[PDB]
Each structure stands twice: as C-alpha cells, then as structure tokens.
C-alpha cells in the first residue's frame, strides 16, 4: 500500500526530512504548507516507517532514514 495510509505529502516529507537530515512538524508545516495535525501525521507515519525517531526536544523529531539520492 501507500497513499491509502500514508499522507499525500509523506513521500515529499520523507525526502524533506532525509535531505535535511531533520524532521520537524513546524518545518514540514511551513515547507509543505499543511496544518500542524498533518505535519505531525506525516512525521507520525515516518515514525511508523522508521524514518523518524522518538521525540526528545520540543516538537523535534530525529531523522533515521537517509535521502532518496544521497
């Protein structure tokens, strides 16, 4: 499956967090122009896929998945 469960911007968000080596709900909000809930959703799924780690700071998610190209 894919979009069925993942967010329409998930793929872009993964590349965004991977390319930036950083996953943030606020970052994706402004970069993807999506409501906070959506950002946290995409990042949430990222945690489900293994792209992001457990949150430690304030809204800061760790990116464990590398970029699509490099």
UniProtKB/Swiss-Prot annotation:
It is found in: Cell inner membrane. It comes from the Bacteria. Induction: Induced by DNA-damaging agents. Residues 2-70 are annotated as: Gamma. Essential cell division protein that coordinates cell division and chromosome segregation. The N-terminus is involved in assembly of the cell-division machinery. The C-terminus functions as a DNA motor that moves dsDNA in an ATP-dependent manner towards the dif recombination site, which is located within the replication terminus region. Translocation stops specifically at Xer-dif sites, where FtsK interacts with the Xer recombinase, allowing activation of chromosome unlinking by recombination. FtsK orienting polar sequences (KOPS) guide the direction of DNA translocation. Consists of an N-terminal domain, which is sufficient for the localization to the septal ring and is required for cell division, followed by a linker domain, and a C-terminal domain, which forms the translocation motor involved in chromosome segregation. The C-terminal domain can be further subdivided into alpha, beta and gamma subdomains. The alpha and beta subdomains multimerise to produce a hexameric ring, contain the nucleotide binding motif and form the DNA pump. Belongs to the FtsK/SpoIIIE/SftA family. Homohexamer. Forms a ring that surrounds DNA. Interacts with FtsZ, FtsQ, FtsL and FtsI. This is DNA translocase FtsK. It comes from Escherichia coli (strain K12).
């Amino acid at each position: 499956h894919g979009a069925e469960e993942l967010d329409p911007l998930f793929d872009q968000a993964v590349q965004f967090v991977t390319e930036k080596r950083k996953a943030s709900i606020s970052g994706v909000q402004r970069q993807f122009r999506i409501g906070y809930n959506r950002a946290a959703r995409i990042i949430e799924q990222m945690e489900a896929q293994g792209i992001v780690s457990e949150q430690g700071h304030n809204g800061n998610r760790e990116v464990l998945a590398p970029p699509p190209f490099d």
